[PDB]
């Protein structure tokens, strides 16, 4: 089997992408941030404290035919950006793009953090990090997309996102019109949990490319691109009047900058993101000083190459015996 589904920018920064991802019987259809960083399927729901609900479509196991309340499950998950969320777990069907999985854990939200109140664009996540991190205690639930593996043509499913526009998910099978030249793979340790991959080395604008190990993770539910400080001093020095603030939480640019590309290697291959894609604009409305895209992992404790990284590419999480990722330029 295969699904397709579009995955659409909740914002003009492209702060995050949102995929209508299909639970119960009827159908409910919720709109759900799919996170290569995660590992769970939670939801805003019937049972959410009603104050942190605040616009999101909410999934109701009650009117659900197919939904069962798995006993004794709870979650709890805490994000590397310090929102959070907690509830218990029902098995329900799921699909996404003509994709479906029958007894998927569909946890569901008892309690949000504010960001996630505040966003109401977001009806909840679905995690498509390795299961090892799910947090479904006392028993440890699947991912949508290990539920869906073996059922699938090819045990993969691929990251196609937009640029200010819509984008595709694809389970199944790699649509070889998606991207320009060849896909490269790269090796994945699974040791975190993460789709984790060494880079191999950078650019920042026209310079040359500077060969060096750089390990991360592949998460299309961060916005930005985390990388060592040295490496995102060297890209900011490029741009007149950038620097890092403290009060802001981050490198700052002048709104009027044109920023330089940035490159980044998968192999003896290379993937440009353009300036453009590094601009996430005011900091706050009407300010000149523009929040940029790619930003210090110091303290993060992991370099993240983010949705401001993966949108440059068509990304392949192959979830073979032995998994790989593979970039290709689009």
């Not at 003009?12 to 590992?39: E, H, M, R």
């Not at 605040?54 to 709890?76: F, R």
């Not at 953090?113 to 699947?142: H, M, R, Y």
């Not at 916005?223 to 950038?242: E, H, M």
């Amino acid at each position: 089997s295969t699904g397709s589904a579009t995955t659409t920018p909740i914002d003009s920064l492209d702060d995050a992408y949102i995929t209508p991802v299909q639970i119960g019987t009827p159908a409910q259809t919720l709109n759900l941030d799919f996170d290569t960083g995660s590992s769970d399927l939670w939801v805003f729901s019937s049972e959410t404290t009603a104050s942190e609900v605040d616009g999101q479509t909410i999934y109701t196991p009650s009117k659900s035919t197919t939904a069962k309340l798995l006993s004794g499950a709870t979650w709890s998950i805490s994000y590397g950006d310090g929102s959070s969320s907690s509830g218990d777990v029902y098995t329900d069907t799921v699909s996404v793009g003509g994709l479906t999985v029958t007894g998927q854990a569909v946890e569901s939200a008892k309690k949000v953090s504010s960001s996630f109140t505040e966003d109401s664009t977001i009806d909840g996540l679905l995690g498509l990090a390795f299961s090892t991190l799910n947090t479904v205690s006392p028993t440890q639930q699947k991912t949508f997309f290990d539920n869906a593996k073996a059922s699938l043509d090819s045990p993969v499913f691929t990251a196609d996102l937009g640029y200010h526009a819509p984008g595709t998910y694809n389970f199944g099978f790699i649509d070889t019109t998606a991207y320009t030249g060849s896909i490269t793979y790269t090796a994945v340790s699974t040791k975190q949990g993460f789709w984790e991959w060494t880079s191999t080395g950078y650019a920042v604008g026209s310079g040359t490319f500077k060969s060096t190990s750089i390990d991360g993770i592949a998460d299309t539910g961060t916005t930005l691109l985390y990388l060592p400080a040295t490496v995102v001093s060297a890209y900011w020095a490029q741009v007149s009047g950038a620097k890092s603030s403290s009060s802001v939480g981050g490198y700052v640019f002048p709104c009027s900058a044109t920023l330089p590309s940035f490159t980044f290697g998968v192999g003896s291959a290379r993937i440009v993101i353009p300036g453009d894609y590094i601009d996430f604009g005011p900091i706050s409305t009407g300010s000149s000083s523009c929040f940029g895209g790619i930003q210090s992992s110091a303290g993060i404790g992991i370099n993240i190459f983010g949705d401001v990284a993966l949108k440059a590419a068509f990304v392949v999480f192959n979830g073979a015996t032995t998994p790989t990722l593979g970039f290709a330029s689009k």
